[PDB]
Amino acid sequence: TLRAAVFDLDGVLALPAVFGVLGRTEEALALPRGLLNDAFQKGGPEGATTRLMKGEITLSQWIPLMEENCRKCSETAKVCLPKNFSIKEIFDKAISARKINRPMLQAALMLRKKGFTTAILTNTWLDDRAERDGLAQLMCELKMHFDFLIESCQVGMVKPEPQIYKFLLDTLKASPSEVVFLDDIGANLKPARDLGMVTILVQDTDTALKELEKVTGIQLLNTPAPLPTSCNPSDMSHGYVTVKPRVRLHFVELGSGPAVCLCHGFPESWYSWRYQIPALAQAGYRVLAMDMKGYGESSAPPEIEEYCMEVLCKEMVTFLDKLGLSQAVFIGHDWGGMLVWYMALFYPERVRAVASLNTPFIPANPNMSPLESIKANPVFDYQLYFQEPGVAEAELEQNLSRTFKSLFRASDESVLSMHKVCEAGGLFVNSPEEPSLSRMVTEEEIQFYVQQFKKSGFRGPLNWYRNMERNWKWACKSLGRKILIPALMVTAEKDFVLVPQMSQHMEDWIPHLKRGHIEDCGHWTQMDKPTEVNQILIKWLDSDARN
Amino acid sequence: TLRAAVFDLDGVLALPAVFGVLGRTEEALALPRGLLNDAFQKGGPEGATTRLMKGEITLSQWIPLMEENCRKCSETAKVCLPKNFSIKEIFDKAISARKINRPMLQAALMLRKKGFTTAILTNTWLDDRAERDGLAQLMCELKMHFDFLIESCQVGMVKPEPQIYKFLLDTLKASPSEVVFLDDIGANLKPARDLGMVTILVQDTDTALKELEKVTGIQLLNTPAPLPTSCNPSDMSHGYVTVKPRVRLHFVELGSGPAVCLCHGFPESWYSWRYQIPALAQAGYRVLAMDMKGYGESSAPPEIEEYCMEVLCKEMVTFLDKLGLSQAVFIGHDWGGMLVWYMALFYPERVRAVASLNTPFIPANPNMSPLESIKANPVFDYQLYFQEPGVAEAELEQNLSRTFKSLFRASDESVLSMHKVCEAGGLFVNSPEEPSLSRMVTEEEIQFYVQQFKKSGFRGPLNWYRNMERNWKWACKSLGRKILIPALMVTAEKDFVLVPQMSQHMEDWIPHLKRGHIEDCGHWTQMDKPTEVNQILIKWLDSDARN
Ligand SMILES: O=C(Nc1ccc(I)cc1)NC1CCCCC1
Ligand SMILES: O=C(Nc1ccc(I)cc1)NC1CCCCC1
Ligand SMILES: [Mg+2]
Ligand SMILES: [Mg+2]
């Protein structure tokens, strides 16, 4: 029966409740109880606060009217007010102190995930204070998790006026009986109740969630930690930059602040960063998630030399030039990680900081040819298999769904054997035709990769492996240098190709290197342990990248 | 004969010359003359400075080696060094002090404009200092004005090695005889000369430009102020955001820093901001030049209600949401200006600051209908002509080139009569078939607008005029508010439709309003006086928008 849940902002989705700062101010200042509450509601429906809440006047216009009420109220109470009493100072502090009530947001997220239509119904104001950005960010973060945000100052109505409730129902396209409404004010629940909808008087979160759990019949409390926010492709801002006549790079962009350029590995896409994009943006950064050359919506020329690291890096510099960015933090994973280490080696001027997941920095060996080196490591046999043009393309392109379902797997799952691929004659020779779905990805997500790769296939992607000698020669030019800019190396315990031990000597070339290590994490680091990645990158960014 | 000009960086395109800080340090510190110069060049071709200049080692790795040389040199000279002598401090200061030599850049720009192939040839280093961003920005600004940038640390060669010169010529695809090379170091000119190319020993800029002027035969000195940098459509980063199922907004983006959203008027496009986009980005802002709904690459639905200000503004908020921006400075012109005033009135939380060119803020009159008001102003007759769907579309779409050539005109040019358009039966009834080309625009630029408008035509654009009553009603909801966020109103003296006097009472609703006024400027403010606009917006942004 229940199909929708409506949450109040102050006191329910955000705490401490701003309205609840009037009482704390009275006690702190030793003023008569409710004095500030009276002045706040002075005049009732005709009062300054109701005009403010309906959108008739702005908050800054209101502040002066509230001070006047505060004097009249004290006047009638025969009490003075502090020497530097200031309504603006009181509300600036109260508003900035208010934060998102996480467990309540989680319950909303869960209900929505199970079919519920969710909305926020709040009496609020048009904030023109010089500190307004604070509230804007709060609303923006919350706003994105609900189907509707109904603000009184926007619709010209205010709880408890029944009109706002009829509006609500109209917006919900639902009848009272199928709506739960939580608020921390009894008076605002009465109208909802009269209309016949379920109502919860929210005092303490746990108790409210218990009632909410009971009435909805869905487990909301004591529930496991959910995964971080992921993004929907069609809700992203999509950018395109032509760095050369036949080369255009695509990227997804989100957030403000220092620029953070994410570089995925093989054979992935910008979407591989779906878990950290919202998180890093929320943390105060401008994220640019790339579709590296050869992938997705980025150009994919056929020539092999078009994918040697020298060229790819140059293009990334041009990419920064075109976007008008003097610098950007470069964070890469797998082949992308190899690319950022070289961006730091050849263009320190352009890299604010560098971070790599799984991929270590190992200076080229002037004496041994790359191919000789590759043959010396059993697990790198598949790389030799990738050399001859067309062979790997055919196998990987035959059944796209199978390819990604076979590759994208957690360590405790049936991970692909990487031993005698050439001898075996293929990469999936010993794999089932219909691989099971990994715990790390949904059927829809796999199909996203499937569609992306239907455009250019694996030729451009595979070409990243066909410039060993060329990249080797270019790398030898930096053997005398050292990475001296902020750097972070993150190792993955269960990555059997890009093993942690492989990075044990990195400090010799990167003295100030900072580290990170993730337990029980496979090769697909971002998908495997998204919560751990975000925590590690954000902590590093705030200390070594933002300054 | 001459077809290319090559410029050195230090001492030629940038001053003061960083290398010239060694002498100033010796005198300041009362050290033996040339002591620092000796240590700087210690070891010659095998010295630390040459390795640094070829890319073998980074600047930070170099600093320690230069200090060692400084001690050995003083040792042999029997002289001590200050107590807190610091090579890093000396170069950090010297490098940040170095700036672009504008008149020299102007000469390069002029020569290039007249067919010359231009390039920068410089001995430089891989900067990994914590202050590296400074140099990166300098290079980026200069870099964009030349065909080639050849840095020694990038190509592994250094002047005076003749190999670098052969490389140069090879890059230029030209023979010595047709190349002019300016440098402030004789030794670096000798090789060029031996190869037979023209060379100029640059001491003082004026003298160098005189020789350069004489040898090229092109006026470079005492020349008029050039127009600010404009952008090439295909070199821009193009962004797309879906704010609704059938509505996707396109914008050009450039720069880092606070977000600045530019909103053009009727019937224009993002390109109308071509002169301020590079400038505002260069000034330290992240510019987002919109193609407003109905134009260019943005969606253009047919329905009239899709263009009422309420909807357009909502979409702009969603646009900010999708991009992950809590705020943005909104700067509009013409209809765009009308849009930002309303963004400030209904979404103060989202507007960091608001600025309008030509369009004043006039609160709706609750008693008079919009149409009544429009008929009361003779110059607004054309608006009545725009009402009936299809009529204006036919005239404006018949000959696109003529439409823009007829509209885009400076005040001293044949500006379109805006008196009895309806009576006249049209907007171009008294206009020539082949309008002359305005001084404000080239034939290519007109054709840019032509192509943009071939996609959707004038229906969506014109619909901006067909929501008078609707916008009026929505506006009446804000009659009790006031604009209290940072605001700037810029008036144009010769704009005969959006007249300056029209904004004379704005302070009644915007007390803290800041102003700007441009003399001898028509309606197309950005195109008309681009240099004045940039100066006014940048000055305001730095004082009221950046904080
Ligand atoms: O090879 C990979 N990743 C990879 C290879 C095969 C598969 I199936 C999945 C990932 N990484 C490279 C990064 C650059 C240095 C050599 C190893
Ligand atoms: O009408 C214009 N601009 C315009 C009109 C006709 C032509 I031909 C060119 C610009 N501006 C509007 C802005 C919003 C308030 C009314 C006037
Ligand atoms: Mg509440
Ligand atoms: Mg020089």
UniProtKB/Swiss-Prot annotation, chains A, B:
Gene: EPHX2
Region (Epoxide hydrolase): 234-547
NCBIfam families, per database record: HAD-1A3-hyp, HAD-SF-IA-v3
Region (Phosphatase): 1-223
Catalysed reactions, semicolon-separated: an epoxide + H2O = an ethanediol; (9S,10S)-10-hydroxy-9-(phosphooxy)octadecanoate + H2O = (9S,10S)-9,10-dihydroxyoctadecanoate + phosphate; 12-phosphooxy-(9Z)-octadecenoate + H2O = 12-hydroxy-(9Z)-octadecenoate + phosphate; 12-phosphooxy-(9E)-octadecenoate + H2O = 12-hydroxy-(9E)-octadecenoate + phosphate
Active site positions: D334 (nucleophile), Y465 (proton donor), H523 (proton acceptor)
Pfam families, sorted: Abhydrolase_1 (PF00561), Hydrolase (PF00702)
Protein name: Bifunctional epoxide hydrolase 2
Residues where N6-succinyllysine is found: K54, K420, K454
Activity regulation behaviour: Inhibited by 1-(1-acetylpiperidin-4-yl)-3-(4-(trifl uoromethoxy)phenyl)urea (TPAU), 1-cyclohexyl-3-dodecylurea (CDU), 12-(3-adamantan-1-yl-ureido)-dodecanoic acid (AUDA), 1-((3S, 5S, 7S)-adamantan-1-yl)-3-(5-(2-(2-ethoxyethoxy) ethoxy)pentyl)urea (AEPU), N-adamantyl-N[']-cyclohexyl urea (ACU), 4-(((1S, 4S)-4-(3-((3S, 5S, 7S)-adamantan-1-yl) ureido)cyclohexyl)oxy)benzoic acid (c-AUCB), 4-(((1R, 4R)-4-(3-((3S, 5S, 7S)-adamantan-1-yl)ureido)cyclohexyl)oxy)benzoic acid (t-AUCB), 4-(((1R, 4R)-4-(3-(4(trifluoromethoxy)phenyl)ureido)cyclohexyl)oxy)benzoic acid (t-TAUCB) and to a lesser extent by 8-(3-((3S, 5S, 7S)-adamantan-1-yl)ureido) octanoic acid (AUOA).
One Gene Ontology term, aspect cellular component: peroxisomal matrix
UniProt keyword annotation of Transferase present: no
Subunit note: Homodimer.
Residues reported to bind Mg(2+): D8, D10, D184
Localization per Swiss-Prot or TrEMBL: Cytoplasm; Peroxisome
Organism: Homo sapiens
Keyword Cytoplasm belongs to the record: yes
Keywords: Acetylation, Aromatic hydrocarbons catabolism, Cytoplasm, Detoxification, Hydrolase, Lipid metabolism, Lipoprotein, Magnesium, Metal-binding, Multifunctional enzyme, Peroxisome, Phosphoprotein
